[PDB]
Amino acid sequence: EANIETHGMVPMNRLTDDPRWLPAMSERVTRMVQRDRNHPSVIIWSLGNESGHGANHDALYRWIKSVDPSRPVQYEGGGADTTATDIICPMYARVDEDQPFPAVPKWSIKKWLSLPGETRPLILCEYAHAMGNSLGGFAKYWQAFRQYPRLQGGFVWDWVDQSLIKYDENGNPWSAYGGDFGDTPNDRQFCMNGLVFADRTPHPAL
Amino acid sequence: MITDSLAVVLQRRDWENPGVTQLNRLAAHPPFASWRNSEEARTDRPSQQLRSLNGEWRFAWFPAPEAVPESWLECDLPEADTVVVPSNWQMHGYDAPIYTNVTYPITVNPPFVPTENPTGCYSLTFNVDESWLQEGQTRIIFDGVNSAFHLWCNGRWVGYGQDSRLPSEFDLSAFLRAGENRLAVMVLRWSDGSYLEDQDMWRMSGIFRDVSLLHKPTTQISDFHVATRFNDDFSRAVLEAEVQMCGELRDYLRVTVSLWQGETQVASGTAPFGGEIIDERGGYADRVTLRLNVENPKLWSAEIPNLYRAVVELHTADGTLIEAEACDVGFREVRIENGLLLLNGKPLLIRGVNRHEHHPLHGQVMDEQTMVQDILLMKQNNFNAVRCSHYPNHPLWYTLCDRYGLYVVDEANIETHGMVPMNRLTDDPRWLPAMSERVTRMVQRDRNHPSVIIWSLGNESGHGANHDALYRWIKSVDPSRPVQYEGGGADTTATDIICPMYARVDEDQPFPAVPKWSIKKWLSLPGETRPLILCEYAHAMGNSLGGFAKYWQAFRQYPRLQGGFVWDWVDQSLIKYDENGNPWSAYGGDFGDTPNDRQFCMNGLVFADRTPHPALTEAKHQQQFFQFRLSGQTIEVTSEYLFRHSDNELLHWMVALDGKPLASGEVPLDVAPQGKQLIELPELPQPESAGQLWLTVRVVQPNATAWSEAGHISAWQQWRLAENLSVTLPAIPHLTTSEMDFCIELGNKRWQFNRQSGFLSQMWIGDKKQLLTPLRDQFTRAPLDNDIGVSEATRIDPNAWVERWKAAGHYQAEAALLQCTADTLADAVLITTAHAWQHQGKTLFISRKTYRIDGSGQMAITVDVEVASDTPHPARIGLNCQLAQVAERVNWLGLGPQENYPDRLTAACFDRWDLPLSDMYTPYVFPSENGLRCGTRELNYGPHQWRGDFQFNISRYSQQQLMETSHRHLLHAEEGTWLNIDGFHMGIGGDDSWSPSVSAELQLSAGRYHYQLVWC
Amino acid sequence: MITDSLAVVLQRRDWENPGVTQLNRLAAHPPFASWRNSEEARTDRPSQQLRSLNGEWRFAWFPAPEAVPESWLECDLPEADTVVVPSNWQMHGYDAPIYTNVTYPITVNPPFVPTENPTGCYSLTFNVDESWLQEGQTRIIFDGVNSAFHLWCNGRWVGYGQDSRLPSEFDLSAFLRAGENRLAVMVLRWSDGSYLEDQDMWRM
Ligand SMILES: OC(O)[C@H]1NC[C@H](O)[C@@H]1O
Ligand SMILES: OC(O)[C@H]1NC[C@H](O)[C@@H]1O
Ligand SMILES: [Mg+2]
Ligand SMILES: [Mg+2]
Ligand SMILES: [Mg+2]
Ligand SMILES: [Mg+2]
Ligand code: NA
Ligand code: NA
Ligand code: NA
Ligand code: NA
């Protein structure tokens, strides 16, 4: 995945729809493909994450398709099914329940496959948000993946808690999140979404 | 002040770095004027917030940027001179312009350029009023700088700009001050942008477009887009205007967009800022989109260029105007549907031409007067479309195309033709940021112009992945216009239109990875569904456009063949001056510029002073919007207009009997778009005199338009009617036999036949000799540019016709007299001759002749010519002599007033024509065979008359002098009149000019040839 | 030596300009080792032409790049510390890591970043063998620098690079010399590339 996320912009595609930022975005995509295109484990290129959908995405999608046709390109931003992705790749679309947000709805993944004119496979780039005591309803996803041929799985969010170690005054280490370093504004425990702790000990969800 | 110095600024070497195409340049946008009055914006009166800095600047030339002294940043150099800006400094004599086609003018080593890099230092002292500095933003706009430049303002470094064909704008608000200011602009001839600017044209440099100051308020309109959407019959339109602001968002802020037709306000909309939700984060709080309904909008097209005026007012909620901008709106929809390019639902037929921005005195500086002259001449010769080969033009060009009606292909300033391979940069992602700015800044500038119907990605840069990326960018940002791009084989994934250059109609050219199929064949290749429009065809280099009618037959027959763009509009000649002051047209290496490609810059339908070449009338006839068929007494007129009724059209018809008018009439045209009108001619008068009856029709426009005078002829056609062959029947000439000559006496007259040469050597009328050179067979012509077959001066085509004629010895062939006898009939004298032309013991041609001199003074000449099948087919089969007469007029019954060739004669008409003798010589800048008129049954020059069925030219320049002279101003008139009378003349070709292009049926390949002539 | 100074190099403010994402960076490519033996390349034994400069570097932290003294381009700062590279300096205590999800860690005003822009000055004295300079090309490879950096080699400015997750490579062949060399790398925490790096993670 290219090193491009402009999530804090308002709207999200404010830079990715601007041709002044097309040269900077183009280097994040093209230098990734030039570096990693011989690795067999890389099967899909991603244009980045949470940067809306802009014309720069469509351009860099087509660049990758011209330079390396051996790998699909995916990109979730701007509604998970834009012209910049070969795969319907939503984040946290539910199995049976629609979430009808105004310009970027998250249809239920069963419903999304049969929308008129939709033919791509669907692979969730993020699903089953493993924040703390979580992964409830995980079996519903895997029932749906096994039943529906174009539901070809997804990527759990995510592998490892992003906790950092701090030390108490007696020397004992402890796992720190968010604003435990005086950092502010922070988002507290939202960095810990892992199936495993930061020392790679498994959570029960694993 | 260390960082502003030339030692610091020049040390990064930003002109040798494709990752730096600009520093501190503002965003691109549509054309702004910053009106502070909405009425002034509506009427497009000149805004006092947009200041023009064109005029006198100080200029110094240096051989490299390192030679520029540091003091130039603060004060004007004493050695600097006063020059007009905009200009190209090569036109002022500071260094030479370079004409190179493919080969780059510098050493190929990207991104580096030569250390000898010619540097123009421009400066301007100028006053800024203090009301511009107390509030608002003052920006400077350079509409065009070639090729790269650094900018200082009051000694402080401002920024750096690239791309010599789009505007570079810089914020000067922190740099200006009250009182005297000073710009210092250091313009470099070569930069890394020069690798993307390898167009086949003169390589010049300087500040060659307008320079302007624009004052905007701090809260400002920063961009606006106008879209038009339609229903299926175009009876309801929605104008969608998206307006973006920069500056402080206040809740009182409003935008009103009003639509005006002439004086009536048709649609208005008022809205605060705030777009609809775009994604999870929201929408643009600094944009607002207004939708205006227009019921039955007058649609825009090249036939009827209906324009509305959109005014975009930024104003507060209590109604105080902050700033207005505006643009002309043309309501039209451009779409490709089911393989056809539609305009307003109708399939276009593109009558196009490529047009460089070229002026022979000002070089590459365009002015409104030349733009208007080009547009008028284009529309008067039935063009409806122009390709901006190969860069964004001056901003006024699109306005004039909006208002006069031309479809425009707007093309990015990207050509990397000299690279090996051609896509070496365009397939490199390091050059993707530089190419992306040439495309995206063109679309941001020109996307509101209705005349622009197609975007082009550039020209002759192979096909790389950067093309595919920028294709898809344009399709995402502006879906209202197709994208085309020829490079890499004309049918890649980077083009919506099959757009080949010089693909032939019927003949494939199967090059290894980029074949040029015949355009009929290309459409039906498996999996091919796009329309085909040639981005270049019919290469008009010199005496050319042979075979032009074959293209237009194919365009009319095949629906997905939707036309093309002729190469090209105007000769790229420049004016030089001889030592006595006389100007002359110069090409290629006439400025000491090497390597150069000589006369290949002159490919125009018109001369550089916009006088038409003879090919332009062939273009006008084939592109005419009315087509004609003659059943028997009925003329069927077909309209090829898509949108307008023939409401300014009058058919004139005339029947003549070999020039003499017998009947004529007038019929108003009343034909719908794409419809037919039947016109029944009256009872024509079946004459008694022998000869061929001819019917000629011409469509005249009785009313002037914005682009043509009253009485303008827009279309014509001629037919043969009934013919009546003559069966009527007509002293005795005395034959002197000497050992050296045969002399035939009749009355005052004498004919002399050299018995050793075998040719008629002299003629006597009264006491005066009539010939300066004997009447002799001629099989060669002074070679056209199509005969010479070169597009790069370093590479010779051994299959070129002039190479084959020279290697066969056609120009060197010596006549061997075989037979020459004389017999006295009982009513005439008959001279019989036979000659063999040989080169190194090979007989190329045999000519057998009989001269019959009767008692009525006529000389009947019969010629039978045999050509060896293994020699290359000769350019002509005819006779040539130097007449002793120099008469003023040429009078003759045959095809057309203008020069016409067997390959290029459809625009000519059979009639009696009478022109001055200078009109029978076409002054092509590179001299060649010229001035031929085909289909001639009678020719009169002074007291002489030739009859038969021949082609001729007549002039004061022999074919030898035309072949040996490189420039038309070096021609000198020879003492008599050179007469070339051809039984047979080869076509001129012109599908391209760098390969053999004469079609096989226009070549003199029959082997045996007969023609008869009567001289009286 | 005027053009190599911090007063000149920092004046363009290349980390506040999306039109400058690098200066003098070499082209990207697949992973190279430059084996001079085909058998070693086949078995992927460690190439002696690929030298690792990980280990102890000298490091100084500054609250902005303007606070970096000009003498750091020539000699190691006396107040600089010895830190392991690769590392994130927030893990060594020099400033705090920031966890922000969506909200950018700086004021949203692209392409500008705060004037308080934490600056890590890294330097390394290292020997180059003389057989590397007599022939061939010696390039330096930074596999990851967060978020932007200027590079000097023996006091001469080499180049600039952004994108904290791909390698930045620079030709050092004209800058090195036999005997002791010295890199000086000025790493900026925030740049215009930070607007493209708003992932939900710790900002280091
Ligand atoms: O694409 C055009 O610029 C080129 N094609 C042939 C023409 O003479 C010119 O060199
Ligand atoms: O796309 C990912 O980086 C984001 N989606 C939710 C997750 O917690 C993270 O913030
Ligand atoms: Mg440059
Ligand atoms: Mg070319
Ligand atoms: Mg930058
Ligand atoms: Mg995010
Ligand atoms: Na499945
Ligand atoms: Na998270
Ligand atoms: Na057609
Ligand atoms: Na040319």
Those residues whose C-beta lies under 8 Å from the C-beta of residue C113, and which sit 6 or more positions away, are: C15, C16, C106, C188, C190, C191, C192, C194
Closest CA to C73 of C20, C172, C174, C150: C150
Give buried/exposed letters for B258-294 (b at 16+ CB in 10 A, else e).
bbbbeeeebbebeeebbbeebbbbbbbebbbbbebeb
Phi-psi label, residue B370: left if phi above 0, alpha if psi -120 to 50, beta otherwise: alpha
For residue B579, count CB atoms less than 10 angstroms from its CB and return exposed for 0-12, middle for 13-18, buried for 19 or more.
Answer: exposed
Residues within 6 Å of ligand 1 by CB: B 101, 199-200, 389-390, 459-460, 501, 536, 567, 603
For residue B80, count CB atoms less than 10 angstroms from its CB and return exposed for 0-12, middle for 13-18, buried for 19 or more.
Answer: middle
Say yes or no: CB of residue A51 within 6 Å of ligand 2: no
Those residues whose C-beta lies under 8 Å from the C-beta of residue A197, and which sit 6 or more positions away, are: A160, A161, A163, A175, A203
Task: Determine the distance separating the centroid of ligand 3 and the alpha carbon of B326, expressed in angstroms.
Answer: 34
Task: Determine the distance separating the centroid of ligand 3 and the alpha carbon of B199, expressed in angstroms.
Answer: 19
Q: How far apart are CA C14 and CA A206, in angstroms?
A: 45
Q: How far apart are CA B97 and CA A111, in angstroms?
A: 66
What residues of A are in contact with residue C98 (Cβ under 8 Å)?
Answer: 181, 183, 186
The type of residue at C54 is N
Strand C55-62 and strand C119-128: pairing? antiparallel
B384 in a labelled binding site: no
Q: How far apart are CA B701 and CA A145, in angstroms?
A: 73
Q: Return the number of other C-beta atoms located less than 10 Å from residue A124's C-beta.
A: 25
Q: Which two tokens stand for residue B726?
A: 């003559």
DSSP type of residue A181 = T
Closest CA to B453 of B534, B398, B514: B398
DSSP C68-81: S-GGGGTS--TT-E
Which ligand lies nearest to the CA atom of residue A110 in the structure? 7
The answer to whether C55 and C85 are in contact (CB under 8 A) is: yes
Task: Determine the distance separating the centroid of ligand 5 and the alpha carbon of A24, expressed in angstroms.
Answer: 8
Q: Obtained via which technique?
A: cryo-EM
Mutate to test the pocket of ligand 2, among A1, A12, A50, A135 (most ligand atoms within 8 A of CB): A50
Q: Ligand 2, atom 3: nearest CA belongs to which residue?
A: C200
Active-site annotation holder among B313, B460, B899, B929? B460
Helix B465-477 to helix A55-67 angle, to the nearest 10 degrees?
150
Task: Determine the distance separating the centroid of ligand 3 and the alpha carbon of B817, expressed in angstroms.
Answer: 70
B539 in a labelled binding site: yes
Measured CA distances, B185 to B4, B69, C3, C116 (Å): 13, 13, 22, 34
Cβ-defined contact of A3 to C192 (cutoff 8 Å): no
DSSP A28-63: HHHHHHHHHTT-SS---EE--SS----HHHHHHHHH
| φ, ψ dihedrals at B203, nearest 5° | -95, 110
**Among all chains, which residue has been given the structure tokens 């009058």?**
B650
Closest CA to C79 of C116, C115, C145, C123: C123
**Among all chains, which residue has been given the structure tokens 């002015």?**
B367
Coarse DSSP helix, strand, coil percentages of chain A, rounded to the nearest 5 percent: 25, 15, 60
Task: Determine the distance separating the centroid of ligand 2 and the alpha carbon of A177, expressed in angstroms.
Answer: 16
SS3 state at B688: coil
In angstroms and rounded to an integer, the radius of gyration of the C-alpha atoms of chain C is: 18
Measured CA distances, B913 to B896, B917, B979 (Å): 7, 12, 17
Q: Which two tokens stand for residue B5?
A: 């110095």
The type of residue at B20 is V
Cβ-defined contact of C200 to A185 (cutoff 8 Å): no
Q: How far apart are CA B743 and CA A95, in angstroms?
A: 112
Measured CA distances, B458 to B200, B399, B409, B941, B991 (Å): 13, 21, 10, 52, 22
A50 in a labelled binding site: yes
Our measurement of the distance from residue B90's CA atom to the centroid of its chain's CA atoms, rounded to an integer in Å, reads 23
Mutate to test the pocket of ligand 1, among B103, B417, B536, B541 (most ligand atoms within 8 A of CB): B536
> Which residue spans within C14-147 are E strands per DSSP?
22-23, 55-62, 81-85, 98-100, 119-128, 139-142
* CB contact B199 to C (< 8 Å): no
For residue B515, count CB atoms less than 10 angstroms from its CB and return exposed for 0-12, middle for 13-18, buried for 19 or more.
Answer: middle
Sign of the Cα torsion B930, B933, B938, B940 reads negative
Question: For every residue of B274-339, which 3-state class applies, written as one string?
Answer: CCCCCECCECCCCEEEEEEEEECCCEECCCCECCEEEEEEEEECCCCEEEEEEEEECECCEEEECC
Task: Determine the distance separating the centroid of ligand 3 and the alpha carbon of A46, expressed in angstroms.
Answer: 30
The answer to whether B501 and B517 are in contact (CB under 8 A) is: no
The answer to whether B643 and B634 are in contact (CB under 8 A) is: no
Closest CA to B999 of B502, B504, B503: B504
Cβ-defined contact of A10 to B281 (cutoff 8 Å): yes
With CA atoms as reference, the chain B residue closest to C16 would be B24
For residue B336, count CB atoms less than 10 angstroms from its CB and return exposed for 0-12, middle for 13-18, buried for 19 or more.
Answer: middle
SS3 state at B411: strand
Facing residue for C196 by CB, picked from A4, A32, A178: A4
**Annotated catalytic, B683?**
no
Measured CA distances, B703 to B623, B648, B664 (Å): 21, 6, 21
Strand B340-343 and strand B119-128: pairing? unpaired
Q: How far apart are CA B704 and CA B723, in angstroms?
A: 38
* CB contact C22 to B (< 8 Å): yes
DSSP B853-890: EETTS-EEEEEEEEE-TTSPPPSEEEEEEEES---SEE
Mutate to test the pocket of ligand 1, among B201, B414, B457, B791 (most ligand atoms within 8 A of CB): B791
DSSP type of residue B727 = -
Our measurement of the distance from residue A58's CA atom to the centroid of its chain's CA atoms, rounded to an integer in Å, reads 18
Q: Ligand 2, atom 9: nearest CA belongs to which residue?
A: C200
Strand B561-566 and strand B532-537: pairing? parallel
With CA atoms as reference, the chain A residue closest to C96 would be A181
Q: How far apart are CA B79 and CA B72, in angstroms?
A: 11
**Annotated catalytic, B680?**
no
**Neighbors of chain C with 3 or more C-beta pairs under 8 Å:** A, B
Q: How far apart are CA A81 and CA A73, in angstroms?
A: 12
Facing residue for B473 by CB, picked from A30, A55, A79: A55
What residues of B are in contact with residue C17 (Cβ under 8 Å)?
Answer: 23
DSSP type of residue C25 = P
| φ, ψ dihedrals at B111, nearest 5° | -95, 20
Q: How many CA atoms lie within 13 A of B970 on its CB side?
A: 12
For residue B363, count CB atoms less than 10 angstroms from its CB and return exposed for 0-12, middle for 13-18, buried for 19 or more.
Answer: buried
The answer to whether A202 and C110 are in contact (CB under 8 A) is: no
Strand B561-566 and strand A151-156: pairing? unpaired
Facing residue for B3 by CB, picked from C11, C22, C27: C11
**Among all chains, which residue has been given the structure tokens 């547009």?**
B375
Helices (H), B669-800: 785-788
Q: Return the number of other C-beta atoms located less than 10 Å from residue A143's C-beta.
A: 12
Closest CA to B757 of B835, B847, B865: B835
SS3 state at B601: helix
The answer to whether B838 and B813 are in contact (CB under 8 A) is: yes
Give buried/exposed letters for B974-1012 (b at 16+ CB in 10 A, else e).
bebbbbbbbbbbbbbbbbbbbebbbbeebbbeeeebebb
Q: Which helix (H) or strand (E) holds B653?
A: strand B650-657
Sign of the Cα torsion B494, B498, B504, B506 reads positive
Q: How far apart are CA B273 and CA B961, in angstroms?
A: 73
Q: How far apart are CA B812 and CA A29, in angstroms?
A: 65
Q: Which two tokens stand for residue B469?
A: 């990326």
What residues of A are in contact with residue B433 (Cβ under 8 Å)?
Answer: 22-23, 26-27
What residues of C are in contact with residue A10 (Cβ under 8 Å)?
Answer: 108
SS3 state at B362: coil
Facing residue for C2 by CB, picked from B8, B19, B22: B8
Coarse DSSP helix, strand, coil percentages of chain C, rounded to the nearest 5 percent: 15, 30, 55
Q: How far apart are CA B215 and CA B171, in angstroms?
A: 10
The type of residue at B325 is E
What is the maximal distance between C-alpha atoms in chain A?
64
Closest CA to B548 of B292, B881, B902, B963: B902
Helices (H), B524-584: 548-557
Residue B294 pairs in a beta bridge with B237
Sign of the Cα torsion B550, B556, B562, B566 reads positive
What is the maximal distance between C-alpha atoms in chain C?
54
Q: Return the number of other C-beta atoms located less than 10 Å from residue B1's C-beta.
A: 10
Structure's resolution in angstroms: 1.4
- The atom number, within ligand 1, closest to the CA of B486 reads 1
Cβ-defined contact of C103 to A190 (cutoff 8 Å): no
- The atom number, within ligand 2, closest to the CA of A49 reads 1
Which ligand lies nearest to the CA atom of residue B280 in the structure? 6
B132 in a labelled binding site: no
What is the maximal distance between C-alpha atoms in chain B?
112
* CB contact A53 to B (< 8 Å): yes
Measured CA distances, B1016 to B520, B749, B943 (Å): 49, 11, 8
Residue A126 pairs in a beta bridge with A91
SS3 state at B438: helix
Q: Which two tokens stand for residue B879?
A: 């006779």
Cβ-defined contact of A177 to C99 (cutoff 8 Å): yes
Sign of the Cα torsion B524, B527, B533, B538 reads negative
Measured CA distances, B768 to B401, B763, B884, B977 (Å): 60, 8, 9, 15
Q: How far apart are CA B962 and CA A119, in angstroms?
A: 68
Report how many helices (DSSP H) and strands (DSSP E) chain B contains, helices first: 12, 58
Closest CA to B787 of B775, B774, B772, B799: B799
DSSP A14-32: TTTT-GGGHHHHHHHHHHH
Those residues whose C-beta lies under 8 Å from the C-beta of residue B470, and which sit 6 or more positions away, are: A59, B412, B435, B436, B439, B440, B457, B494
Give buried/exposed letters for B795-811 (b at 16+ CB in 10 A, else e).
eebeebbbbbbeebbbb
Helix B395-404 to helix B368-380 angle, to the nearest 10 degrees?
40
What residues of B are in contact with residue C21 (Cβ under 8 Å)?
Answer: 19
**Neighbors of chain B with 3 or more C-beta pairs under 8 Å:** A, C
Q: How far apart are CA B14 and CA B149, in angstroms?
A: 10
Cβ-defined contact of A31 to C162 (cutoff 8 Å): no
Those residues whose C-beta lies under 8 Å from the C-beta of residue B404, and which sit 6 or more positions away, are: B305, B375, B376, B379, B706, B707
